[PDB]
Design a protein around this ligand. Sequence first.
Ligand code: HEM
Length: 433
Amino acid sequence: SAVALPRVSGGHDEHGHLEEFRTDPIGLMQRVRDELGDVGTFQLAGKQVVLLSGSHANEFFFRAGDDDLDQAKAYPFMTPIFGRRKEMLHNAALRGEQMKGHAATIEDQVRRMIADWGEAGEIDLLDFFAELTIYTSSATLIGKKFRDQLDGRFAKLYHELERGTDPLAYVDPYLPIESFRRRDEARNGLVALVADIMNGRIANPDRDMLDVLIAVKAETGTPRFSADEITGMFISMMFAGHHTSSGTASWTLIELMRHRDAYAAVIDELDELYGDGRSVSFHALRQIPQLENVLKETLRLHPPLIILMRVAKGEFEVQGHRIHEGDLVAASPAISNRIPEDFPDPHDFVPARYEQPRQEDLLNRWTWIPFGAGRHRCVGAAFAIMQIKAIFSVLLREYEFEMAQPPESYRNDHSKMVVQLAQPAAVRYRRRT
Ligand code: HEM
């Protein structure tokens, strides 16, 4: 007896539109908007997703209180990965007064990663940036000491965790599928790496977070936290900022290479700015215009999170369409960031959009959403931007990059809820001079 909301075409497979969502989620979300407008739905297994788009619908979505649109249970694929607390996990390291030190830490991690590059060579962006950001994340959020005890193994296993986010999780996150199996196995591997580090510290003692948790005794003198508990906490702290920063660093370089005029502009800028003799820790926290605009455009075109989920906790009305409790409600940066009315020539790379005269990011407060908006806006935004500035201030002044494959061959893999750059993503480098 209730009015059914508009539903997008297709979705006749076993789990509705889920199968298409696993193969081409952006095409699906775009068809929802093309056929229905600002409010439309698609079937995700046994759930109905009310996909909102456009300034009006997005405003409702982002300004909604935690009591109206709940985020907590919107991402089922995360529970098996982790194994209020949101503030704790990040807040601490994101304090402005700590940014300078983090920038210096990031610079050091980058230099360490490129220490063996030599005069010239070739890298794969996913392998490089995924590993690099594991080191930047662990160093800044857990401690340099802890990072120094990590190698490529931790990175490989963390990546397996991320790949264990198939949309099938919306059916059941524990289904006996290979990606879920590899996910659980990788988490056990991570717990083992942590246990090994804990043991090593026992035998032979700049203290970090692990030293703190390790010293915490219960009452009988027995350690309070197990390797599993600690690893779960560490995984939690590093997740929000890993795939996002990794992917964004990859696309920033790709777009720079695809657009040599912007690349040249950034180079000139970097050389001039650093001509003042100040460190990356100083400049990564201050204006670097051209690079910043290249980053903003890269994020508009390649938002690491293409869909944002919520669970309706009540009935609401958006444009005459009624949302019911239990309804999954979503917004899409992938789609919204390319609305033609809001962003002239939305498929074109135009950093100038963000220059003082245009400022399309600030003008479209509800549709330029790579970092989300409203109360749930990305709390790591300032940090992520600082990181890009620090990373490229190093890379672009030390090396020159060129695509080793067709410009159009670089693409993302959208088969999992966590988007990852697809491979190969081969790039050649050569020392600058
Ligand atoms: C340029 C890279 C990044 C992008 C594009 C990005 C994007 C986003 C987006 C779109 C959201 C909203 C999710 C939602 O509404 O469900 C978000 C949330 C969040 N991000 Fe990021 N993020 C980035 C880097 C980071 C980093 C490095 C950290 C770690 C400090 C971080 C921590 C968080 C947290 C804790 C939330 C949840 C905020 C809340 O519930 O209010 N992000 N991010």
